Design an enzyme around this catalytic site. Structure first.
Site, PDB file in Angstrom:
ATOM      1  N   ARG A  97       0.902  -1.162   0.000  1.00 47.63           N
ATOM      2  CA  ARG A  97       0.000   0.000   0.000  1.00 47.63           C
ATOM      3  C   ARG A  97       0.949   1.223   0.000  1.00 47.63           C
ATOM      4  O   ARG A  97       1.967   1.170   0.667  1.00 47.63           O
ATOM      5  CB  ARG A  97      -0.749  -0.076   1.289  1.00 47.63           C
ATOM      6  CG  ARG A  97      -1.825   0.938   1.523  1.00 47.63           C
ATOM      7  CD  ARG A  97      -2.663   0.468   2.762  1.00 47.63           C
ATOM      8  NE  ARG A  97      -3.217   1.615   3.457  1.00 47.63           N
ATOM      9  CZ  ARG A  97      -3.477   1.674   4.753  1.00 47.63           C
ATOM     10  NH1 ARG A  97      -3.250   0.643   5.556  1.00 47.63           N
ATOM     11  NH2 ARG A  97      -3.964   2.791   5.247  1.00 47.63           N
ATOM     12  N   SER A 155      -7.653  -1.434   2.040  1.00 46.97           N
ATOM     13  CA  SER A 155      -7.432  -1.821   0.661  1.00 46.97           C
ATOM     14  C   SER A 155      -5.926  -1.961   0.418  1.00 46.97           C
ATOM     15  O   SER A 155      -5.127  -1.120   0.864  1.00 46.97           O
ATOM     16  CB  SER A 155      -7.993  -0.706  -0.266  1.00 46.97           C
ATOM     17  OG  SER A 155      -7.834  -1.039  -1.631  1.00 46.97           O
ATOM     18  N   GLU A 200      -6.813  -6.088  -6.288  1.00 44.61           N
ATOM     19  CA  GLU A 200      -7.068  -5.388  -5.046  1.00 44.61           C
ATOM     20  C   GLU A 200      -7.406  -6.454  -3.994  1.00 44.61           C
ATOM     21  O   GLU A 200      -8.356  -7.259  -4.226  1.00 44.61           O
ATOM     22  CB  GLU A 200      -8.285  -4.490  -5.169  1.00 44.61           C
ATOM     23  CG  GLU A 200      -8.533  -3.735  -3.884  1.00 44.61           C
ATOM     24  CD  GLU A 200      -9.740  -2.770  -3.983  1.00 44.61           C
ATOM     25  OE1 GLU A 200     -10.510  -2.786  -5.004  1.00 44.61           O
ATOM     26  OE2 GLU A 200      -9.918  -2.003  -3.027  1.00 44.61           O
TER      27      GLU A 200
END
Length: 204
Positions: free
Chosen positions: A86, A116, A153
Site C-alpha cells: 500500500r 485496501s 485489489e
C-alpha cells in the site's frame, strides 16, 4: 434465477461499486452527510423508518458493515500470497499522530475502515507499506472493477491490525535493498525523492 443472491453477497457488490466512500467515512470518524447514509440504510432495509436515536442509527450502520464483511469473507482465499502493498501519504501535517504510530517498531495500528491493498503494486508515495500476511487472514482478492485496472485489489474487513516490524528511511543503507522487493507504480519521474520511508508490517 433459480436462487436469489444473498443480502451479504449483494452488500459486498453494492459496497464495491458505489457505497465504499460513504461507509468508510463513517467508520473512520471522518465527515459525511447523514442524508445519503440514512437513504442507504433505508433503501437497503437496515432501517424501515428514520432513526430515533444515535444508537439506532449506529446499530444499523453496523449491520450494514457486518453484511459487507460476510460477503467479503465468503470470497475464495488466496493462501499462495505472502505480501501485499500500500502507498500512502504520512507526511501530511494532519496525520502526524498516524505517522508517529507507523514509525515506531512494535506499535500496532488499527484500521477502522476496510483496508485496501494490492498484491501487485504500491503507488509511489512518501511511505510504502510491505504487509506480511499470516495464515488464514481475512484479506480477499475482489473481482474486476469498472473504475480501474492494471492491478489486483485485496480488501480486508474492518478493524484489521498491523504490527510495525521495521522502519527503513530513504537515508538508510537498507533502503534500496527493501525497495527492490516492493513492486512500485512508475518512479521514473524527474522528482527522485518522492519515497521517504518503507515500513514492513504484519497483519495480526
Amino acid at each position: 434465477g433459480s436462487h436469489m443472491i444473498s443480502k451479504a453477497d449483494e452488500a459486498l457488490r453494492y459496497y464495491s461499486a458505489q457505497g465504499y466512500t460513504l461507509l468508510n467515512n463513517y467508520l473512520r470518524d471522518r465527515p459525511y452527510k447523514q442524508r445519503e447514509a440514512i437513504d442507504t440504510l433505508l433503501s437497503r432495509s437496515y432501517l424501515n423508518d428514520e432513526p430515533t436515536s444515535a444508537g439506532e442509527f449506529d446499530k444499523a450502520m453496523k449491520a450494514y458493515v457486518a453484511d459487507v464483511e460476510a460477503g467479503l469473507a465468503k470470497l475464495p482465499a488466496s493462501p499462495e500470497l505472502s505480501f501485499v502493498y500500500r502507498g500512502l501519504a504520512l507526511d501530511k501535517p494532519e496525520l502526524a499522530a498516524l505517522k508517529e504510530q507507523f514509525t515506531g517498531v512494535g506499535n500496532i495500528v488499527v484500521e477502522p475502515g476496510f483496508m485496501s491493498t494490492s498484491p501487485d503494486k504500491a503507488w509511489v508515495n512518501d511511505t510504502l507499506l510491505k504487509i506480511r500476511l499470516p495464515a488464514g487472514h481475512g484479506g480477499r482478492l475482489l473481482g474486476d472493477a469498472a473504475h480501474f485496472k492494471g492491478e489486483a485489489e485485496m480488501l480486508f474487513p474492518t478493524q484489521t491490525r498491523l504490527r510495525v516490524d521495521r522502519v527503513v528511511s530513504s537515508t538508510s543503507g537498507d533502503f534500496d535493498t527493501l525497495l527492490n522487493t516492493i513492486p512500485t507504480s512508475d518512479n521514473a519521474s524527474d522528482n527522485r525523492n518522492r519515497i521517504k520511508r518503507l515500513i514492513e508490517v504484519s497483519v495480526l
